[PDB]
Swiss-Prot record, chain A:
The chain holds residues 2 to 147 of 173 of the full protein. Belongs to the eukaryotic/archaeal RNase P protein component 2 family. Its main location: cytoplasm. One of its GO terms (molecular function) is ribonuclease P RNA binding. GO terms for cellular component: cytoplasm; nucleolar ribonuclease P complex; ribonuclease MRP complex. Keywords: Cytoplasm, Hydrolase, Nucleus, rRNA processing, tRNA processing. The keyword Ribonucleoprotein does not apply. Present with 2230 molecules/cell in log phase SD medium. The lineage of its organism: Eukaryota, Fungi, Dikarya, Ascomycota, Saccharomycotina. Component of ribonuclease P, a protein complex that generates mature tRNA molecules by cleaving their 5'-ends. Also a component of RNase MRP, which cleaves pre-rRNA sequences. Its EC number is 3.1.26.5. This is Ribonuclease P/MRP protein subunit POP5. It catalyses: Endonucleolytic cleavage of RNA, removing 5'-extranucleotides from tRNA precursor. It is found in: Cytoplasm; Nucleus.
Curated annotation (Swiss-Prot), chain B:
Present with 846 molecules/cell in log phase SD medium. This is Ribonucleases P/MRP protein subunit POP1. The chain holds residues 530 to 613 of 875 of the full protein. Required for processing of 5.8S rRNA (short form) at site A3 and for 5' and 3' processing of pre-tRNA. It comes from Saccharomyces cerevisiae (strain ATCC 204508 / S288c) (Baker's yeast). Component of nuclear RNase P and RNase MRP complexes. RNase P consists of an RNA moiety and at least 9 protein subunits including POP1, POP3, POP4, POP5, POP6, POP7, POP8, RPP1 and RPR2. RNase MRP complex consists of an RNA moiety and at least 10 protein subunits including POP1, POP3, POP4, POP5, POP6, POP7, POP8, RMP1, RPP1 and SNM1, many of which are shared with the RNase P complex. The gene is POP1. It is found in: Cytoplasm; Nucleus.
Length: 146, 84
RNA sequence: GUGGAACAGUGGUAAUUCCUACGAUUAAGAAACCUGUUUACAGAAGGAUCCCCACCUAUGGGCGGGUUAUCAGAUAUUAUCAGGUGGGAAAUUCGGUGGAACACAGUGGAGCCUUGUCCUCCGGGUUAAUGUCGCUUUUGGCAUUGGCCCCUGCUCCUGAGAGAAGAAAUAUACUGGGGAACCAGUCUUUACCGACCGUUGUUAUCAGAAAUUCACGGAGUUCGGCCUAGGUCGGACUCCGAUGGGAACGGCAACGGUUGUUCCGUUUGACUUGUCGCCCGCUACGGCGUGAGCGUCAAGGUCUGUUGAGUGCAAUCGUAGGACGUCAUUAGUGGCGAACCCGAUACCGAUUACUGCUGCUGUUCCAGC
RNA sequence: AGAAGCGGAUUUAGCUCAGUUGGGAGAGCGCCAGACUGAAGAUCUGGAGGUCCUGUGUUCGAUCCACAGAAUUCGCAUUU
């Protein structure tokens, strides 16, 4: 006997809103300009407290009651700004739509959230994340060598 | 050393025949009935040798675009009777 | 006895209903997930035709040099894609297999003894020989010896599975229950004769003569001694004796003589790394450099080396349309395809949970005369 | 809320646990009461308190023995 809970990978991307500053047009350069850094006051509990407030103000209470049954952040590190949220397979739609409507953190505004990978296991999501980061290193190395 | 030496007076020298079979792409080796098992037991103790079933032999004949008598021969008398 | 309705028990079998399409990438394995499009070739390996210049011969032609046009199965396309994704039970763990090669106890070694006895089933029948006792060609009974005859139910390596008890019965061997097919335990299987192995301990208190064939009391028979109106004594057998579930070598538990017992070791791996040895070159006291070479040894370095599903904080999806089945309708459509449950190495047997079908059996109710 | 598969151990009063030729159903704690103290704790005495996990069957009789159906719980070089 086991439980069939799905995990969702998300990444915090900062859009470079600079109206007076010029821009360079390339692939890995705009990957550098979007994958810059996470700010100082970002942790597991801060992202959980923000997403529960977004779940309250956006989806309500009983929808928040269905979502908050197994709403946990299993793995997150601020150095790469990628996180894995555990959820049910039925309310995965609700969790992804809550991840979409994330507007701003209470400390830092001007950011979007990208839900990338959903699977019922975390080990294949880690294997996909290593391969996706390997492809990012490939693009960076191709633009760095030439 | 791990061996037993051969003696021309008191050791059972066997006849051994290994031939190629063309269309089924496989090597068949023929031997007397009671001699087969001392040859057969030492075969898959080589760690890269497994055994075949008749459904697996049908799969091998299916893979090499070949034909098989109880299943892929419907034209003949016995094949038609048995299969149908 | 029959037909219908309902319930119950057992045996057998089946379970995503099936098909179709879709679900982001030059960052080319992101619908949840896996595998595959890897035995490289266009008879283009001195390829074929053709352009220009020079040479030799003439009825055809060949050689040398230079750039380069056409052609390589549907005059095409180098950069797409396909298939599958839970079961009888996957739950239960009782079992065994992939280590044994047909009992060749799978093999080897050591120790001990009763030193591994080509032995013996007891037992029953026939035949031959001997000795005794009664009839007297001869036969009958007893004891010994020798010879023969007396039954793998089926498949399977194992585990196990199910078949029938006319050689004495009506209930199909015995015992207990079931409502009946039957179930459980002891057993036997063409037994043309049957065969419940032995030892140890237990059945507490009371009762009874006695809780294990101790013993004791009565009756009957046979034999021996004293003895002879047959009285008594001893030994053997049979039967009975108020009690308790009870006297029945019956029930329960443990151990083995089977082909001597016991112990120890593997016959199980593939890649990676390290050491050692073998051929080549330099150097010569053991040395050094390469072979994408081989053999042995070691290592908690690895095992998607993974399976027409193969995960390992444990995937097995969502939706639309069509085909089929059941049930309910007011105009004709709506709902449902489940219950139990769900891998983690695979196999098979048995058990348990639920739905539907099928055969048998038992009970109740209702009639045809 | 960290499965799956393997072995070992185990279920008895409300609790923690004994125990068993197979013939009585228990101890400590807790509850109540007695005793004691000005009062209370401790000590001590007594009573109440049972689905011996459930079921079959063996036996004359089951916590015990046999079978079936549940499970409890540990370990897998761990403190998640
Ligand atoms: Mg399982
Ligand atoms: Mg299991």
């Amino acid at each position: 006997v086991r439980l069939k809970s799905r995990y969702i990978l998300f990444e915090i991307i900062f859009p470079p809103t600079d109206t007076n500053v010029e821009e360079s047009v390339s692939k890995a350069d705009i990957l550098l300009s979007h994958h810059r850094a996470s700010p100082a006051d970002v942790s597991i509990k801060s992202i959980l407290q923000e997403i529960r407030r977004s779940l309250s103000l956006n989806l309500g209470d009983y929808g928040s009651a269905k979502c908050n049954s197994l709403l946990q952040l299993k793995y997150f590190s601020n150095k790469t700004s990628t996180g894995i949220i555990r959820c049910h397979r039925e309310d995965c739609d609700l969790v992804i739509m809550a991840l979409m409507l994330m507007s701003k953190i209470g400390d830092v505004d001007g950011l979007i959230v990208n839900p990338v990978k959903v699977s019922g296991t975390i080990k294949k999501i880690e294997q996909f994340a290593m391969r996706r980061n390997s492809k990012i290193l490939n693009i960076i190395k191709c633009s760095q060598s030439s | 050393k791990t061996t037993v030496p051969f003696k021309e007076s008191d050791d059972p020298s066997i006849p051994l025949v290994i031939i190629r079979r063309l269309k089924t792409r496989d090597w068949i080796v023929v031997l007397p009935w009671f001699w087969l098992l001392p040859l057969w037991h030492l075969l898959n103790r080589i760690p890269r040798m497994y055994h075949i079933g008749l459904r697996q032999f049908q799969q091998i004949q299916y893979e090499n675009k070949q034909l098989y008598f109880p299943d892929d021969y419907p034209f003949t008398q016995l094949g038609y009777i048995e299969n149908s």
